[PDB]
Design goal:
The PDB classes it as ribosome. The chain is mainly α. 50% of the residues lie in helices and 0% in strands. The protein has helices at 12-15, 36-52, 55-67. 0% of the residues are buried. The protein binds four RNA strands through residues 1-22, 24, 26-31, 35-61, 63-65, 68.
Length: 68
RNA sequence: CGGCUACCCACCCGACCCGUCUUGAAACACGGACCAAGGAGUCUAACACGUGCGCGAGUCGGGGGCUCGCACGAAAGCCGCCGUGGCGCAAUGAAGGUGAAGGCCGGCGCGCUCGCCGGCCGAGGUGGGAUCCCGAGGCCUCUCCAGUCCGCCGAGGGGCACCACCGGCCCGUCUCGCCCGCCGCGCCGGGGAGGUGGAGCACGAGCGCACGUGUUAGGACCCGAAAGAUGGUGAACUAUGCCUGGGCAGGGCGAAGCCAGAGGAAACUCUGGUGGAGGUCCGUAGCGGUCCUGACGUGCAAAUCGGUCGUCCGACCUGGGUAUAGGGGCGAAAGACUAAUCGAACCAUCUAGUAGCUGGUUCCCUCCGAAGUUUCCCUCAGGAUAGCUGGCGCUCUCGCCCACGCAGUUUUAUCCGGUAAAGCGAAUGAUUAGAGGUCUUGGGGCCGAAACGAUCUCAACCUAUUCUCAAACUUUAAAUGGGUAAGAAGCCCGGCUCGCUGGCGUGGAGCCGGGGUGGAAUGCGAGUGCCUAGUGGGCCACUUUUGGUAAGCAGAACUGGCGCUGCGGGAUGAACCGAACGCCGGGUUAAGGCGCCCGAUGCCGACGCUCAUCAGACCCCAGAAAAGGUGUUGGUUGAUAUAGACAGCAGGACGGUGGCCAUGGAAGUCGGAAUCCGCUAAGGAGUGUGUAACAACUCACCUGCCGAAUCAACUAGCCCUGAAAAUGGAUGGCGCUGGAGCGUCGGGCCCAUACCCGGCCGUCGCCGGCCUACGCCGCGACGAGUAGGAGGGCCGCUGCGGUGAGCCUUGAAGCCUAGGGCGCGGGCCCGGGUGGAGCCGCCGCAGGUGCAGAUCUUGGUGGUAGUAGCAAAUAUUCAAACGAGAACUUUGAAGGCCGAAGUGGAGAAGGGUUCCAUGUGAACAGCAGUUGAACAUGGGUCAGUCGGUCCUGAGAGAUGGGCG
RNA sequence: GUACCCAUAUCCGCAGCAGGUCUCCAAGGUGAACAGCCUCUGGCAUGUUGGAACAAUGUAGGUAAGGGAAGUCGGCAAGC
RNA sequence: CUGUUUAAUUAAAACAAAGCAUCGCGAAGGCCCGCGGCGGGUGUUGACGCGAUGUGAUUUCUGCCCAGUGCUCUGAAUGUCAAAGUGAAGAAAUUCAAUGAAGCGCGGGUAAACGGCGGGAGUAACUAUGACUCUCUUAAGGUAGCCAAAUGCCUCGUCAUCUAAUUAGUGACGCGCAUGAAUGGAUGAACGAGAUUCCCACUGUCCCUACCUACUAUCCAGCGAAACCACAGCCAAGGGAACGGGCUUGGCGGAAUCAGCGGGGAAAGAAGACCCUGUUGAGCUUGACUCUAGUCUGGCACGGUGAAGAGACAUGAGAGG
RNA sequence: CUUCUGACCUUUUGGGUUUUAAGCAGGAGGUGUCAGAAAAGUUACCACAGGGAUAACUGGCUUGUGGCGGCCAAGCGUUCAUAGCGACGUCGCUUUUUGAUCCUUCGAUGUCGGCUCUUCCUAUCAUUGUGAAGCAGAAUUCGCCAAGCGUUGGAUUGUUCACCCACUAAUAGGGAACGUGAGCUGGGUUUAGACCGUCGUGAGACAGGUUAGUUUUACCCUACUGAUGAUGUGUUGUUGCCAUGGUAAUCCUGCUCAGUACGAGAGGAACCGCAGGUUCAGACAUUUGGUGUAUGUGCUUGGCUGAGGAGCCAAUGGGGCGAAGCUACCAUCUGUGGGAUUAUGACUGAACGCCUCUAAGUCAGAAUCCCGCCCAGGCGGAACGAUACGGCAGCGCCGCGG
């Protein structure tokens, strides 16, 4: 009662049927796992961007449109 | 005259018997004698997903009620103040409980990491994103003005679905914090800011019906066990008691008791009779069954027969009645017997019990098409999980100087490794040998009373060297290989925000706006989701490799193949070498081959080698080495030959010197040291022949005749030796020798389903037409296939609603058919003949729906075959009769057997009319029959005194009683 | 109740199956005898068929010159 | 010894058996059955009996071990000790303590109860063998006997006899792998359908076969099946699932047959009884696991009357260091 | 599941207070078969579903082990490497030893040994023909062609093997599914009974020993043996031929040769021949012996026919003789030559001016081989005979024409 124990034959020819493609990798990669201190920085950074970035950036857009 | 045909026959070539387990099937693996009918994935519940329909934040009457009692009405219809209820619309906590809105602007409180107020909008934002919109400019017959109208658009705008990310909100917890509320001021509530767990929200998509697939529970694809439980039936065989009856020829051995005689003093002894005891001896019936391992062994028989046997007054044999009943009985004990069954009887039910295990698993065509691997399991014949497959789609991309994305690939850069190899005078580990040196000893020798007093030697040590190694060593270090990059997600500029960081407006991230896509080669359409079958027993080949002596052995790596696969070669084959398959006509080739089987060299083919008394003849491959050859053929390196070798013929083979060792010979000749010189042409102070010794003689050495190559080693091609196995045999055979062998090649030639060209069918894709739009044509690329999956079937069987002014007694169904056809088929249509009363087409619908098998079930018939076989116990013959008919019936005669423990005369149990007569001879009697126990008709069993009835026995059984 | 078989053909054994089954009566000769053999009373046609011939092998039986276990696991079988 | 047994493979050396032992029990008992009752059986019985075993005539014998394992007797002797009962803490559920039946452990006996019975080293005026001596050691270390046996591996042990020759048979030897005393040892007249060897007589068992009879078998008259059967049946070699009939290449091959014969058809019988797997079972056994009838105890009821003594509690007085 | 810890935690079901219990969060108590069942043995009385995924028997690959060889030459062999051996090493062959593997069969291939019987191999024990020896003769040893023909009788053990006695010319080695069970035998192994020893507390085990223990069927096809036959020649018969197949003869002794050769002697040959024998084959029955049912003859037991006479029955009643026939190595008879050649020995003669058996040529040469002699004669053929009345016929050769 003895059988062939382990092999890796006929494995590459199975793997390359559908193809060994890459893992997609879309834009704006997943941001979990990054440094919590940096993340606590960047969240308040974003919400205060969206808070105070109206007036002076609108001024600078008017200024750069007047220049060009 | 034409004709395909399931008619028959001839011929060439191909051609092993199907189904399944299997890596492998024609297998000396299993199932199948033949034929007809039956025969296997159904139904319900539940779930998931896809599909079709209706309604839609709803939906559903499936439970009831309502209508007159009408076949189809067990239908259908209605309810809505019948929505009770299911599922969903809201999740989350263990629970107490709690429970999804933000954005934009203006202002205030220190706008302070902070809260409040006022207005408006309303599910935030970033990058892609089908579509839509706008549009510079572009183009339509003289020049001006014209409008629709035409179409491409660089670029720009809003942006569906969906994807990716950030931000927001709810609930549970954790951390840090301060403020507010007051049916009552408290170990009371409410709130804030962060990081986390959630099956969440972030404008909802379900519900009902039906169909498909898959999974699970059910007898659940079909058949299959040894078992277990419940409840009953058996002691007619057998086991053992008990009761009541029955049975056992003759003989041999000769105890107790007795008698007589003799002896003795007594005790008692001796001799001859009588006597008839024995779990006693030979042997009959009876009972058993040892041996022949005899006969038989599809028998006479599901345990017999024939010889030969054991025991027969006994623990004997035996009939009837009666008792003991299944985990129980009984057992002189063998686990034997208990109705042909016993190491747990028989019958029915639970029961269609269970099975990871064998066997089977029924119509066609089209398309796609595997795996025998990872992990886990009391897992190792199995399952779950990934991987491989198929189906269903969906989202984009095309068509009208350049795209998106991708890659079993290369290049250009750039990293990584520690194997092949190499290395030890580089570490570690082993290891050979020589040389040099003088510190250290011990040990040898010598000068010496002794002294590192001096010296020689030894080992050890060190120094540079030298030979060989390493999977568990290494400085070095390949080839093959692995990753990344080769641009708009990128550059560059400018600015805002940050509680993070901090000399610094510093760093880093994020956000916003702007600017310029031509950034290696080559090829292609890509991305993505669901469901899920089969698979989880492998094997071979090149190369690299582990264990082993080795294997057609076991175990690995990379790639291919076989399995799942044909075809052309290797004769024959799974795996080899070419090459992969729709059906065909022409041409060409591949791998191979061209004496003849057998298509092609039937070339005035090229060059050489080899003769075998066992030749040789093509990867895998199907038998051979070490060694040797003056067999021949090349080749290498030397040595001789013109001042003549080489072998052949001819001449000699001395002298100082019978030199010396000896006096056994030796005057070169068994043995010993040696060894010079002269003459020459050269002689060896003599190789040997032979006289025991003296001697002729030769060899070494020398010279003539001679005429041109010769000698010695060594090497590799063919061939030979080495070479021996069982039935007679294998380059395939026949054969084959100026080849039909070996090696080198050439020119022609042969052919596979490969390639090309052309036709035809189908699939797929890309379309085209306002012609069954589910049809029609057009274009082009392709078609293999087991397990498996889908699609189509105007394939088929049976039934139901609809329809064909369907079909038929002027002949339907079914059956047969050397008849005519169609389709690639499933099958069908017509003709002809039987046949005698129902049948089909189409659109839907619903199934107990299609046979070769399952040692399938039932029914029938073959081959074997007019065969084996009608043989245990001696045996018949003649005449006559009745009769269609006489080996068997009956009578006579004759000859026989059974031979009184019978083949006789009568009974018990059992059988039930068989008893008897008459009549028949169809079937039965295993041949026949006038016969019978066969069939048909009709008869026969007479009792106070024969027995049952009556009695009790072994026992069985009722009331009283007790238990249940 | 009373027939009949009571068994190599009326029972059981799947049957007209050499199997099995309970008892009584039992002559003459030989002989010890109901031993085996032959007759008599009393039954019977040879046991589910016949004819022709006399091969092998058989199955049952019987002899053998010399030697007497040499055969064979064994004197098994047969013979004394 | 006679007897009996596995009917349908064994006839025995097995079984019983008389004889010998051993054990329980004086009836409110032993040993059993039974679902149940003082229901049955032994029992219509009473130790010369009933019940349960071992051994197996007589004759002669019955050795040594209580360590293990059983069995048994003994005492609340004292550790362990279950319900119920007592007492304490607590609002109570509950908790704790003391007391403590059987049994277990402690102690005694038993081997005609199961069973068991050593190995070294030296040592005698030729060598060997070794009575003796020392040591470790167990509970005891095989005593009387007996043997290459039915028990002895090595093994065809060694010697003698038997035969020409003997792995056989007998007789003796004994540090006997691993003999042995009721697990019975050793003899032993009679008898074994028991097993083995040799001798005499006898013979077809043989050298060596031959013949004869009966019944078949043969042919014919009649009447006639069954097993089995993919297809059918000539061989060599090769390859192949590795030993073809069928494939390939060769050898070759005439219809239809009868009587034989057993080489083949890996013939036919039978889903291998040997082996392995199964998470398939049944017999059995015990110091496997989980239980249970039966049984031994303790408690509570049925369950009463009379007398006496005490353990300890309840109360207070006196001694008490 | 238990246990412990943490919160002024939650729930403890009509509402409260307290005990208790449940819960959240995180630590421990174990699953060593370690992703975790709680677990002893035996079956020879066994059963069931299966496996050739998996042993025992053969077959196949392999050749360590076994057996059989070859090369080199240190030595042994009085001297002397190779007459005969040969270490140290080394290369092979064999499948008759054992082992390895699991490829085939587990819905069965009957398993050891013996008896009988056929054929084959050669790695030759003897015989024929030869060569070499440390071959004087004899007796041996080693080689070559060579498997034609032989290779026995017995005691033991079941044996293969082994060992022994005796014969012999010699007691060679093997294969064919470890040939051969529808041929036997069943002694052993290998069931169920039983005993003994060891082991196990036990059911029981023991390639430890002893003993008793059912061996099935052929009529199918092929093969083989034997017998009818079948095709063509018109029929049919006689006489025959031979293609092909089969093959059988073999060995020893005595007497002369001769106690001669040879040998110091002890010892001791060979050829031709002449007698026989062994083994085998083919016959045959005059003799000898069997057989005996001419049921031939004559005794004889018991019974039967009244008795003598004649007979009969007793599964051929017994035994005494015995015809014919069948038969025996238990009687007798017969068994035979030609050719090419192998091994070897030579001749002539080059290669190689010599030599040489070889290179071309030749010769002698045998139990081998083939044929003769001897068996059977084919989908093989000859030569010859007669070739169909009766009453028409019928049938042949020749000529025809339709
Ligand atoms: Mg596997
Ligand atoms: Mg299987
Ligand atoms: Mg296999
Ligand atoms: Mg097949
Ligand atoms: Mg089959
Ligand atoms: Mg069959
Ligand atoms: Mg049918
Ligand atoms: Mg509601
Ligand atoms: Mg059970
Ligand atoms: Mg039961
Ligand atoms: Mg019952
Ligand atoms: Mg009875
Ligand atoms: Mg007696
Ligand atoms: Mg006697
Ligand atoms: Mg007798
Ligand atoms: Mg008798
Ligand atoms: Mg009997
Ligand atoms: Mg009998
Ligand atoms: Mg028999
Ligand atoms: Mg027979
Ligand atoms: Mg007697
Ligand atoms: Mg039972
Ligand atoms: Mg029975
Ligand atoms: Mg079923
Ligand atoms: Mg069933
Ligand atoms: Mg597995
Ligand atoms: Mg797919
Ligand atoms: Mg490495
Ligand atoms: Mg290396
Ligand atoms: Mg499936
Ligand atoms: Mg599997
Ligand atoms: Mg392998
Ligand atoms: Mg394998
Ligand atoms: Mg497969
Ligand atoms: Mg493939
Ligand atoms: Mg292929
Ligand atoms: Mg081919
Ligand atoms: Mg080939
Ligand atoms: Mg082929
Ligand atoms: Mg073509
Ligand atoms: Mg070519
Ligand atoms: Mg040709
Ligand atoms: Mg050469
Ligand atoms: Mg040849
Ligand atoms: Mg296809
Ligand atoms: Mg009618
Ligand atoms: Mg129709
Ligand atoms: Mg029809
Ligand atoms: Mg129906
Ligand atoms: Mg059906
Ligand atoms: Mg059918
Ligand atoms: Mg089928
Ligand atoms: Mg069948
Ligand atoms: Mg049938
Ligand atoms: Mg039939
Ligand atoms: Mg016959
Ligand atoms: Mg017949
Ligand atoms: Mg008869
Ligand atoms: Mg008449
Ligand atoms: Mg008449
Ligand atoms: Mg008759
Ligand atoms: Mg008689
Ligand atoms: Mg009678
Ligand atoms: Mg009849
Ligand atoms: Mg009549
Ligand atoms: Mg009558
Ligand atoms: Mg009647
Ligand atoms: Mg009267
Ligand atoms: Mg009376
Ligand atoms: Mg009663
Ligand atoms: Mg009467
Ligand atoms: Mg009878
Ligand atoms: Mg009888
Ligand atoms: Mg009488
Ligand atoms: Mg009388
Ligand atoms: Mg008298
Ligand atoms: Mg009869
Ligand atoms: Mg005789
Ligand atoms: Mg005689
Ligand atoms: Mg005699
Ligand atoms: Mg013997
Ligand atoms: Mg006898
Ligand atoms: Mg006699
Ligand atoms: Mg009895
Ligand atoms: Mg018997
Ligand atoms: Mg009693
Ligand atoms: Mg005694
Ligand atoms: Mg004792
Ligand atoms: Mg004690
Ligand atoms: Mg208590
Ligand atoms: Mg005491
Ligand atoms: Mg001594
Ligand atoms: Mg002793
Ligand atoms: Mg003798
Ligand atoms: Mg003997
Ligand atoms: Mg002992
Ligand atoms: Mg003992
Ligand atoms: Mg034939
Ligand atoms: Mg063959
Ligand atoms: Mg092969
Ligand atoms: Mg073969
Ligand atoms: Mg062979
Ligand atoms: Mg066959
Ligand atoms: Mg053929
Ligand atoms: Mg025949
Ligand atoms: Mg036969
Ligand atoms: Mg089976
Ligand atoms: Mg398993
Ligand atoms: Mg059983
Ligand atoms: Mg409560
Ligand atoms: Mg309450
Ligand atoms: Mg695990
Ligand atoms: Mg068990
Ligand atoms: Mg037993
Ligand atoms: Mg296998
Ligand atoms: Mg095998
Ligand atoms: Mg088979
Ligand atoms: Mg068989
Ligand atoms: Mg066979
Ligand atoms: Mg021969
Ligand atoms: Mg054999
Ligand atoms: Mg036997
Ligand atoms: Mg035996
Ligand atoms: Mg036995
Ligand atoms: Mg016997
Ligand atoms: Mg035949
Ligand atoms: Mg001939
Ligand atoms: Mg005579
Ligand atoms: Mg005579
Ligand atoms: Mg006579
Ligand atoms: Mg007389
Ligand atoms: Mg007279
Ligand atoms: Mg007379
Ligand atoms: Mg008479
Ligand atoms: Mg007579
Ligand atoms: Mg003869
Ligand atoms: Mg010659």
């Amino acid at each position: 009662a003895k059988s062939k124990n382990h092999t890796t034959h006929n494995q590459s020819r199975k793997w390359h049927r559908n193809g060994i493609k890459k893992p997609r990798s879309q834009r704006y990669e997943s941001l979990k796992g990054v440094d919590p201190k940096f993340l606590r920085n960047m969240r308040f950074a974003k919400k205060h961007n969206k808070k105070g970035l109206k007036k002076m950036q609108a001024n600078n857009a008017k200024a750069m449109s007047a220049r060009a």
